[PDB]
Amino acid sequence: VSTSTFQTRRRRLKKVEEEENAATLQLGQEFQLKQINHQGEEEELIALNLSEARLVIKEALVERRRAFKRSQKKTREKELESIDVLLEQTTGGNNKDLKNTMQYLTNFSRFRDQETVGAVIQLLKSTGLHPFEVAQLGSLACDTADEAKTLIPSLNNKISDDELERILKELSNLETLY
Amino acid sequence: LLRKKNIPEVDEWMKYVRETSGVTTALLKDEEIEKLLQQDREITNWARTTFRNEYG
């Protein structure tokens, strides 16, 4: 038995179209902008820049360790060892995917502190740009507004070159000095 | 309140400190000399560089 979603659509006999997934912002049916949470409320897609993601997972495993000990009653290279220890505590251990993920995240995160990831998240989610771009803008370090618009091609006409270049400056300024 | 710059009771141990130095009203020529002398102290501090080589 495998996992299901909040997307209920009834594909009766009519198999296909399964139209390709590209950054023409045409992601899956599953990674659509209009999502639905377990409380039925229509809620927007949640995309994470690897740092926003690093923090989320760390937070979740930290809180899990709490309940695991409760139910039992009756510097980056330094973060890697610290995280690899938390994984030994909460995770199934067979889950090697999370181990690599956490290592990659620790080594590639642009913003260390939660405070930092807070401003990143503000500055960006005010552009009206779709969660995918807003994440790739947070996770890909670009200098020219062309570097950005080339790598994130979906952006193309969505933002001024200057407006994007102004953002790229105040993004570089937020980067935690590793 | 919100537009005001001052110092608190603070400025006072700032005086305790200023008066704790060896100076105050004797002017420019004798003062320039003290500067060269403090610089000589920093140069005698380089001596720390020499001794650090020894720690080796």
Partner: peptide, 25 residues
């Protein structure tokens, strides 16, 4: 996103920042 909200404390009862000497005409 530094923390969440911003910590009030606003104060006019503090030590004091103003002196006084031009009161005389």
């Amino acid at each position: 996103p530094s923390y969440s909200p911003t910590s009030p404390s606003y104060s006019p009862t503090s030590p004091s920042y103003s002196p006084t000497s031009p009161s005389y005409s």
